[PDB]
Amino acid sequence: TVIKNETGTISISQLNKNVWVHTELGSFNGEAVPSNGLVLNTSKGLVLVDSSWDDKLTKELIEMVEKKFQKRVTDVIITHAHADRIGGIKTLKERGIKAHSTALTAELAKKNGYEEPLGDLQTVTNLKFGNMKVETFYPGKGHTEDNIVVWLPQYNILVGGCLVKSTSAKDLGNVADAYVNEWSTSIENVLKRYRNINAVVPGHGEVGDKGLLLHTLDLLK
Ligand SMILES: [Zn+2]
Ligand SMILES: [Zn+2]
Protein backbone atom coordinates (compact mmCIF):
# COMPACT_ATOMS: atom_id res chain seq x y z
CA THR A 1 0.00 0.00 0.00
CA VAL A 2 2.23 2.82 1.32
CA ILE A 3 6.00 2.30 0.91
CA LYS A 4 8.15 4.82 2.80
CA ASN A 5 11.78 6.37 3.01
CA GLU A 6 13.31 8.38 5.89
CA THR A 7 14.68 11.97 6.14
CA GLY A 8 13.32 14.42 3.59
CA THR A 9 10.70 11.87 3.22
CA ILE A 10 9.54 9.99 0.13
CA SER A 11 6.45 7.77 0.03
CA ILE A 12 4.68 5.82 -2.65
CA SER A 13 1.09 4.57 -2.41
CA GLN A 14 -0.52 2.17 -4.82
CA LEU A 15 -3.68 3.16 -6.67
CA ASN A 16 -3.88 0.06 -8.83
CA LYS A 17 -1.75 -2.81 -10.20
CA ASN A 18 0.53 -0.55 -12.27
CA VAL A 19 -0.15 2.95 -10.94
CA TRP A 20 1.33 4.46 -7.82
CA VAL A 21 1.36 7.95 -6.38
CA HIS A 22 4.65 9.41 -5.24
CA THR A 23 4.61 12.06 -2.53
CA GLU A 24 7.64 13.99 -1.28
CA LEU A 25 7.98 16.54 1.48
CA GLY A 26 9.64 19.81 0.38
CA SER A 27 10.45 22.42 2.99
CA PHE A 28 12.17 25.80 2.93
CA ASN A 29 11.79 27.53 6.29
CA GLY A 30 8.10 28.32 6.87
CA GLU A 31 5.88 26.80 4.15
CA ALA A 32 6.50 23.01 4.27
CA VAL A 33 4.79 20.89 1.64
CA PRO A 34 4.17 17.41 0.16
CA SER A 35 3.75 17.34 -3.61
CA ASN A 36 2.40 14.43 -5.66
CA GLY A 37 3.30 12.71 -8.90
CA LEU A 38 2.67 9.26 -10.40
CA VAL A 39 4.83 6.17 -10.92
CA LEU A 40 3.69 4.04 -13.83
CA ASN A 41 4.97 0.46 -13.82
CA THR A 42 5.06 -0.46 -17.52
CA SER A 43 6.51 -3.51 -19.28
CA LYS A 44 9.02 -1.15 -20.87
CA GLY A 45 10.19 0.48 -17.66
CA LEU A 46 9.05 3.00 -15.07
CA VAL A 47 7.47 6.30 -16.17
CA LEU A 48 7.01 9.16 -13.73
CA VAL A 49 4.51 12.01 -13.89
CA ASP A 50 6.61 14.83 -12.44
CA SER A 51 10.00 14.68 -10.68
CA SER A 52 10.48 16.42 -7.32
CA TRP A 53 11.45 19.61 -5.44
CA ASP A 54 15.17 19.15 -6.07
CA ASP A 55 17.83 16.76 -7.33
CA LYS A 56 18.45 15.14 -3.94
CA LEU A 57 14.80 14.07 -3.67
CA THR A 58 14.61 13.14 -7.34
CA LYS A 59 17.57 10.74 -7.06
CA GLU A 60 16.05 9.08 -3.97
CA LEU A 61 12.71 8.68 -5.69
CA ILE A 62 14.29 7.09 -8.78
CA GLU A 63 16.46 4.85 -6.66
CA MET A 64 13.50 3.79 -4.54
CA VAL A 65 11.29 2.82 -7.47
CA GLU A 66 14.02 1.19 -9.57
CA LYS A 67 14.99 -1.12 -6.74
CA LYS A 68 11.37 -1.99 -5.87
CA PHE A 69 9.93 -2.64 -9.33
CA GLN A 70 13.23 -3.95 -10.68
CA LYS A 71 13.27 -1.84 -13.84
CA ARG A 72 14.70 1.54 -14.89
CA VAL A 73 12.89 4.88 -14.93
CA THR A 74 12.97 5.72 -18.63
CA ASP A 75 10.69 8.75 -19.02
CA VAL A 76 9.30 11.63 -16.96
CA ILE A 77 6.38 13.97 -17.76
CA ILE A 78 6.85 17.52 -16.32
CA THR A 79 3.44 19.20 -15.79
CA HIS A 80 4.67 22.79 -15.37
CA ALA A 81 7.93 24.78 -14.95
CA HIS A 82 7.89 25.31 -11.16
CA ALA A 83 10.45 23.75 -8.76
CA ASP A 84 8.16 21.09 -7.24
CA ARG A 85 7.73 19.72 -10.77
CA ILE A 86 11.06 20.40 -12.53
CA GLY A 87 13.56 20.72 -9.67
CA GLY A 88 15.14 17.38 -10.51
CA ILE A 89 15.60 18.03 -14.23
CA LYS A 90 19.44 17.96 -13.98
CA THR A 91 19.34 14.44 -12.45
CA LEU A 92 16.95 13.24 -15.17
CA LYS A 93 19.14 14.72 -17.93
CA GLU A 94 22.44 13.29 -16.70
CA ARG A 95 20.97 9.80 -16.21
CA GLY A 96 19.53 9.63 -19.69
CA ILE A 97 15.89 9.81 -18.49
CA LYS A 98 13.61 11.38 -21.11
CA ALA A 99 11.95 14.55 -19.75
CA HIS A 100 8.78 15.30 -21.75
CA SER A 101 7.04 18.70 -21.60
CA THR A 102 5.30 21.20 -23.82
CA ALA A 103 7.40 23.75 -25.72
CA LEU A 104 6.06 26.43 -23.37
CA THR A 105 7.15 24.55 -20.23
CA ALA A 106 10.58 24.06 -21.87
CA GLU A 107 10.82 27.82 -22.68
CA LEU A 108 9.80 28.83 -19.18
CA ALA A 109 12.23 26.36 -17.64
CA LYS A 110 15.04 27.77 -19.79
CA LYS A 111 13.93 31.33 -18.93
CA ASN A 112 14.19 30.51 -15.20
CA GLY A 113 17.66 28.90 -15.31
CA TYR A 114 16.73 25.22 -15.47
CA GLU A 115 17.92 22.64 -17.94
CA GLU A 116 15.44 22.09 -20.71
CA PRO A 117 12.99 19.24 -20.94
CA LEU A 118 12.09 18.03 -24.46
CA GLY A 119 9.28 20.38 -25.42
CA ASP A 120 7.73 17.53 -27.37
CA LEU A 121 4.18 17.53 -25.98
CA GLN A 122 1.45 19.24 -28.05
CA THR A 123 -2.01 20.32 -26.81
CA VAL A 124 -3.09 16.67 -26.87
CA THR A 125 -0.35 14.02 -26.98
CA ASN A 126 -0.87 10.30 -26.75
CA LEU A 127 2.07 8.21 -25.68
CA LYS A 128 2.37 4.53 -24.83
CA PHE A 129 4.94 2.83 -22.68
CA GLY A 130 4.87 -0.93 -22.83
CA ASN A 131 1.13 -1.42 -22.67
CA MET A 132 0.51 1.69 -20.53
CA LYS A 133 -1.37 4.41 -22.42
CA VAL A 134 -0.84 7.98 -21.36
CA GLU A 135 -2.48 11.11 -22.71
CA THR A 136 -1.20 14.64 -21.99
CA PHE A 137 -3.54 17.61 -22.35
CA TYR A 138 -2.98 21.36 -22.16
CA PRO A 139 -6.36 22.79 -21.06
CA GLY A 140 -5.28 26.42 -20.93
CA LYS A 141 -3.85 28.70 -18.26
CA GLY A 142 -4.62 28.33 -14.56
CA HIS A 143 -2.13 27.72 -11.77
CA THR A 144 0.53 28.68 -14.33
CA GLU A 145 0.50 29.63 -17.98
CA ASP A 146 1.82 26.22 -19.01
CA ASN A 147 0.17 23.69 -16.70
CA ILE A 148 -0.89 20.38 -18.27
CA VAL A 149 -2.88 17.46 -16.93
CA VAL A 150 -2.19 13.79 -17.55
CA TRP A 151 -4.82 11.16 -18.27
CA LEU A 152 -4.63 7.35 -18.00
CA PRO A 153 -7.44 6.12 -20.34
CA GLN A 154 -7.19 2.51 -19.24
CA TYR A 155 -8.00 3.55 -15.68
CA ASN A 156 -9.78 6.91 -16.09
CA ILE A 157 -7.27 8.44 -13.70
CA LEU A 158 -6.48 12.11 -14.05
CA VAL A 159 -3.31 13.73 -12.72
CA GLY A 160 -4.46 17.30 -12.18
CA GLY A 161 -1.15 18.67 -10.97
CA CYS A 162 -1.26 22.16 -9.50
CA LEU A 163 -4.29 23.16 -11.67
CA VAL A 164 -6.33 21.04 -9.22
CA LYS A 165 -6.54 21.75 -5.48
CA SER A 166 -7.25 19.06 -2.88
CA THR A 167 -10.17 19.19 -0.42
CA SER A 168 -7.74 20.40 2.27
CA ALA A 169 -6.68 23.38 0.14
CA LYS A 170 -8.77 26.26 1.46
CA ASP A 171 -7.21 28.82 -0.91
CA LEU A 172 -5.43 29.13 -4.29
CA GLY A 173 -1.95 28.91 -2.79
CA ASN A 174 0.68 30.66 -4.91
CA VAL A 175 -0.99 32.81 -7.55
CA ALA A 176 2.07 34.87 -8.54
CA ASP A 177 2.28 33.05 -11.88
CA ALA A 178 -1.44 32.27 -12.12
CA TYR A 179 -4.29 33.35 -14.40
CA VAL A 180 -7.29 33.40 -12.07
CA ASN A 181 -9.74 34.60 -14.72
CA GLU A 182 -8.79 31.79 -17.16
CA TRP A 183 -8.32 29.02 -14.58
CA SER A 184 -12.06 28.26 -14.42
CA THR A 185 -12.35 27.80 -18.20
CA SER A 186 -9.29 25.55 -18.17
CA ILE A 187 -10.93 23.43 -15.48
CA GLU A 188 -14.12 23.35 -17.50
CA ASN A 189 -12.02 22.19 -20.50
CA VAL A 190 -10.78 19.24 -18.43
CA LEU A 191 -14.32 18.36 -17.25
CA LYS A 192 -15.58 18.52 -20.82
CA ARG A 193 -12.74 16.38 -22.22
CA TYR A 194 -13.00 13.71 -19.50
CA ARG A 195 -16.67 13.20 -18.61
CA ASN A 196 -16.09 9.95 -16.64
CA ILE A 197 -13.25 10.20 -14.07
CA ASN A 198 -12.29 7.49 -11.56
CA ALA A 199 -9.67 9.27 -9.44
CA VAL A 200 -8.06 12.71 -9.52
CA VAL A 201 -4.58 13.31 -8.19
CA PRO A 202 -3.95 16.93 -7.10
CA GLY A 203 -0.46 18.45 -7.26
CA HIS A 204 -0.50 18.53 -3.43
CA GLY A 205 -2.75 16.81 -0.92
CA GLU A 206 -4.94 13.71 -0.81
CA VAL A 207 -6.26 11.91 -3.88
CA GLY A 208 -9.91 12.58 -4.69
CA ASP A 209 -12.33 12.50 -7.60
CA LYS A 210 -14.16 14.90 -9.98
CA GLY A 211 -15.10 16.75 -6.80
CA LEU A 212 -11.61 18.24 -6.61
CA LEU A 213 -12.23 20.01 -9.92
CA LEU A 214 -15.49 21.43 -8.54
CA HIS A 215 -13.68 22.39 -5.34
CA THR A 216 -11.08 24.35 -7.36
CA LEU A 217 -13.84 26.16 -9.35
CA ASP A 218 -15.24 27.25 -5.98
CA LEU A 219 -11.87 28.52 -4.76
CA LEU A 220 -11.71 30.67 -7.90
CA LYS A 221 -14.87 32.53 -6.93
ZN1 LIG B 1 3.43 25.53 -9.45
ZN1 LIG C 1 2.79 22.91 -6.74
201, 207 in Cβ contact below 8 A?
yes
5 as an active site residue: the answer is no
Side-by-side strand order, sheet with 149-152: 124-129, 132-137, 149-152, 157-161, 199-202
State yes or no: 162 annotated in a binding site: yes
Give buried/exposed letters for 93-127 (b at 16+ CB in 10 A, else e): eeeebebbbbebbbbbbeeeebebbbbebeeebeb
The neighbourhood of ligand 2, an ion, using CB within 5 A, equals: 84, 162, 203
> What technique determined this structure?
X-ray
CA distances from 212 to 40, 80, 110, 159, 201 (A): 22, 19, 31, 11, 9
Query: CATH assignment of 1-221?
Result: 3.60.15.10
Q: Which of 1, 121, 108 is nearest to 49 (CA)?
A: 121
DSSP string, 20-58: EEEEEEE--SS--EEEEEEEEEETTEEEEE---SSHHHH
Q: What is the resolution of this structure in A?
A: 1.9
State yes or no: 170 annotated in a binding site: no
The active-site residue, picked from 80, 100, 146, 215, is 80
State yes or no: 100 annotated in a binding site: no
Mark residue 105 as left, alpha or beta (left: phi above 0; alpha: psi -120 to 50; beta: remaining): alpha
Domain boundaries, the chain: 1-221
215 as an active site residue: the answer is no
